[PDB]
């Protein structure tokens, strides 16, 4: 359960719903660690009746001694409360205190949520539990075919997009000398140029690389030729990001009415138009790692000639036994022509009789090819070959 000292240090409303709710918190937006290791929250210092823009990072125990006004205090002039009586918190409990007795102010109205929870709009209208499911489902969103900004947002989308590394941010300002689907080349401004000639700045963009959740991540160059850029702006939108704004899902037209019972509990009815627009359409990337092994019967070889297979399976492969990049395959088709040298030619008479009767090929090498697992399909987009020294570099390598 949440102690009343988690205010502005960890998010009270974001935590997994499994057997470890409350054990796994998320850091607040403004929270940070002190040199010792205890957490602190920024707070505006209130001089006597003036709330200075100066910030002090009050510690967990430091918050206890002091009295802190709520982030919803209304301030005019140079930082004076419009209220002689202001909501405050001294030990974790609320109170109403004199405007000239407060010690500190919350720097922001949003300084008590995680980044996951901060994005939810109208958070002040949901159930705490329900908004907790909402925050936990924020994370589980998958990047759609296009990034679509949320028409109703919180304004932290830009901060999250920039701070996370999925966004190619312009390191040094300049004018974009070159834009392409893979590279961005910035002719850096001379005032930011270094002694000698550091010349241009090149941002190579990750394009269709498997994330750890098998979700495709790629970066779209949002800028165009000759567009001036300054330090700290977006050169290319990452996955689930549009114009430097975090774009988790997509905006749908919605009508709230129990249309012919197809919305019974929380079930949602979708228009065929959504499928037409290919929105909410997701790319997913699998990895099928085929490793050649060194065995006691012979070191395994990656070859394009596989026994006991037809020409159709071989027709998607190159001469090196690896499928073409860009071929449409389905569960069962051969990707990598792995064969294990069958150094053991002696077998039971049953096996020999079966292979003779069934008409299967008999060789001193056994098939080991990695076929597409049944249930997955798609198009091959990457082939990576890892070859340690001492092994010949084949054509694909």
């Amino acid at each position: 359960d949440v102690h009343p000292t988690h205010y502005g240090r960890v998010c009270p409303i974001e935590t997994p719903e499994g057997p470890n709710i409350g054990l796994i918190n998320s850091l607040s937006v403004y929270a940070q660690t002190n040199e010792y290791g205890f957490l602190e929250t920024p707070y505006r210092k209130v001089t006597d009746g003036v709330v200075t823009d100066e910030i002090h990072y009050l510690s967990a125990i430091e918050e206890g001694n002091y009295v802190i006004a709520q982030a919803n205090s209304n301030l005019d002039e140079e930082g004076h409360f419009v209220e002689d009586l202001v909501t405050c918190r001294s030990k974790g409990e609320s109170s109403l205190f004199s405007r000239d007795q407060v010690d500190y102010m919350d720097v922001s109205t949003q300084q008590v949520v995680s980044v996951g929870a901060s994005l939810i709009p109208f958070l002040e209208h949901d159930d705490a539990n329900r908004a907790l499911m909402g925050a936990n489902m924020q994370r589980q969103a998958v990047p759609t075919l296009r990034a679509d900004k949320p028409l109703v947002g919180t304004g932290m989308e830009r901060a999250v997009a920039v701070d996370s590394g999925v966004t190619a941010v312009a390191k040094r300002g300049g004018v974009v000398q070159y834009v392409d689907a893979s590279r961005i080349v910035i002719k850096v401004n001379e005032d930011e140029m270094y002694p000698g000639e550091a010349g241009i700045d090149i941002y190579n963009l990750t394009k269709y690389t498997r994330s750890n959740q098998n979700t495709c991540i790629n970066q779209m160059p949002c800028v165009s030729l000759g567009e001036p850029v300054e330090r700290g702006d977006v050169l290319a939108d990452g996955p689930s990001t549009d114009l430097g704004e975090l774009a988790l899902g997509q905006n749908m037209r919605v009508a709230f009415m129990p249309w012919n019972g197809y919305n019974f509990e929380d079930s949602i009815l979708v228009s065929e138009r959504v499928v037409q627009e290919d929105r909410f359409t997701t790319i997913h990337i699998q990895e099928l790692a085929c490793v050649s092994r060194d065995t006691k019967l012979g070191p395994e070889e990656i070859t394009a000639d596989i026994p006991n297979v037809g020409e159709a399976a071989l027709s998607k492969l190159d001469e090196s036994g690896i499928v073409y990049i860009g071929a449409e395959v389905t569960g069962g088709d051969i990707l990598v022509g792995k064969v294990t040298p069958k150094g053991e030619t002696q077998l039971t008479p049953e096996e020999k009789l079966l292979r003779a009767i069934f008409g299967e090929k008999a060789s001193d090498v056994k098939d080991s090819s990695l076929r597409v697992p049944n249930g997955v399909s798609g198009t091959v987009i990457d082939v990576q070959v890892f070859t340690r020294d001492g092994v010949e570099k084949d054509k694909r390598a």
Binding site: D1, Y7, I21, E124, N129, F264
Partner: protein, 524 residues
């Protein structure tokens, strides 16, 4: 040690008894399936009945071997669709929820082959399954021998299992959507198009409403012919003129013969529809009951759709005097706390005083909100304004018992207010903000404590309930009714439980379903 591992004899309990001829998939709602049907994806069926399909294919001569059957099914030719329709003509399937906490947790259905990739569960059964539609996945099994199939049909199917095996009473009650549709359609108004005329049975009620000439709601005299069970089981057709509403007659079309009209009048709530289904079961039987349930589901959904009952933000109503009552509450607590600093009240004293003040304020706010709801719509008859059941969608939304309660719609428009703090004690200052209005940062922070506490409580109670079910099953499982009568005139005194002045439960409820141990006499 090989005698016993965990949890015992390995092959009769955990671990882990995974079984073939079964599947698992997320569930969607199909409001067109009849109560004995479940919508099952075509691929799921095709891979659940491959042996039966092979048998049929080689039976028709369409395949000469298992290899030909494999090719024939994998090529997805149009012929296998007829084969699968044949093997699924009436072959039922068993759906079980991932946790089965009561007997109904597994039930049979007739599978209807559907497009998609989710199991279309009957909407009215999901309440019995104690499931929802949130990504939770149901599991299908196929009782695949004849005798298992008949065990499924006679016992497993939801048609034969409609009452809870815990207290009797139907478990197949309309829950949230169809009940909203019925509550809307059976409501009355004080003035609408089509008011006052006389119509030849519900025939003309349907004809006139579906013309859009007469509103669904109108004080209308209709000559209805209702059937009553009398004598040794005969039906008497009593025809009389009844003061009803057009929608109520249209609904009366649903109810089969042999039921009174005392059920399909009045605004139908969830308890009212519970009563209707219970009476139908206890008066006609099961077949009229199942047909009535399916038809009333269809009609409730259809007229919920035609209603367009929608939830916005102007529908939820903020009482005009809520802030006034609040400000009175702060004035009172200010006086009390001034006495506290005056040393006039002890800590517990003013604590309880403030708690009572805020409870009274919450009660007043809820009363004002509900008073605003109950007659939010006022309509003239021929010049004078009249109250009547509010057209307000949020009022039907919970008054029908669709979803929510007076507490929940009380905490949306009015304050959810007082709640517990860490150490489980009530906060001095309630959550004075609604959800239609905003929540202050500290208010939401405080509210989060309760939600976290509830979620932890939920997880722990799920685990402990599983354990308790286990121990009780272990202690009770070796107990089977095996004799019809032992002649034991011994019994128990069995009385209506009454605490204080209030009778908590009626002896009428208890006595039902028991057998007397003596011959009861009259009280005189």
């Amino acid at each position: 040690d090989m005698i016993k591992g965990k949890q015992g004899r390995f092959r009769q309990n955990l671990l882990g008894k995974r079984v073939d001829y079964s599947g698992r998939s997320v569930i969607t709602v199909g409001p067109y399936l009849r109560l004995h049907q479940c919508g099952l994806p075509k691929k799921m069926a095709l891979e659940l009945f491959k042996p039966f399909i092979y048998g049929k294919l080689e039976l028709r001569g369409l395949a000469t071997t298992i290899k030909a059957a494999k090719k024939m099914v994998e090529r997805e030719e149009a012929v296998v669709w007829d084969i699968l329709d044949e093997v699924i003509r009436e072959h039922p399937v068993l759906l079980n929820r991932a946790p089965t906490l009561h007997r109904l947790g597994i039930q049979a259905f007739e599978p209807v082959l559907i497009e998609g990739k989710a199991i279309q569960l009957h909407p009215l059964v999901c309440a019995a399954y104690n499931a929802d539609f949130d990504g939770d996945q149901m599991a299908v099994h196929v009782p695949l021998t004849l005798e298992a199939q008949l065990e499924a049909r006679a016992l497993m199917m939801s048609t034969n299992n409609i009452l809870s095996p815990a207290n009797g009473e139907p478990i197949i009650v309309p829950s949230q959507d169809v009940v909203l549709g019925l509550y809307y359609m059976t409501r009355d108004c004080v003035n609408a198009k089509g008011e006052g005329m006389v119509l030849t049975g519900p025939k003309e009620a349907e004809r006139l409403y579906r013309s859009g000439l007469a509103s669904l709601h109108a004080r209308v005299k209709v000559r209805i012919t209702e059937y009553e069970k009398d004598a040794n089981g005969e039906l008497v057709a009593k025809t009389s003129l009844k003061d009803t509403t057009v929608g109520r007659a249209i609904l009366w079309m649903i109810v089969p013969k042999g039921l009174p009209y005392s059920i399909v009048n009045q605004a139908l709530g969830k308890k009212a529809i519970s009563k209707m289904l219970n009476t139908c079961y206890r008066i006609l039987g099961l077949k009229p009951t199942v047909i009535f349930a399916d038809q009333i589901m269809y009609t409730g959904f259809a007229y919920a759709a035609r209603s367009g009952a929608s939830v916005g933000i102007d529908d939820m109503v903020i009482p005009e005097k809520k802030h006034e009552i609040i400000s009175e509450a702060e004035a009172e607590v200010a006086e009390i706390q001034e006495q506290f600093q005056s040393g006039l009240v002890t800590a517990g004293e003013r604590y309880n005083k403030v708690i009572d003040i805020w409870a009274a304020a919450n009660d007043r706010v809820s009363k004002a909100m509900m008073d605003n709801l109950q007659t939010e719509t006022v309509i003239n008859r021929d010049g004078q304004e009249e109250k009547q059941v509010s057209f307000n969608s949020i009022y039907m939304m919970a008054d029908s018992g669709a979803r929510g309660s007076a507490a929940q719609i009380r905490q949306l428009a009015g304050m959810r207010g007082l709640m517990a703090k860490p150490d489980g004690s009530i906060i001095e200052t309630p959550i004075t903000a609604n959800f239609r209005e905003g929540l202050n940062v500290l208010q939401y922070f405080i509210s989060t404590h309760g939600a976290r506490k509830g979620l932890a409580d939920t997880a722990l109670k799920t685990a402990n309930s599983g354990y308790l079910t286990r121990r009780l099953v272990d202690v009770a499982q070796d107990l089977v009714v095996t004799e019809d009568d032992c002649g034991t005139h011994e019994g128990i005194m069995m009385t209506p439980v009454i605490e204080g002045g209030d009778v908590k439960e009626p002896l009428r409820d208890r006595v039902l379903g028991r057998v007397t141990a003596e011959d009861v006499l009259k009280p005189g």
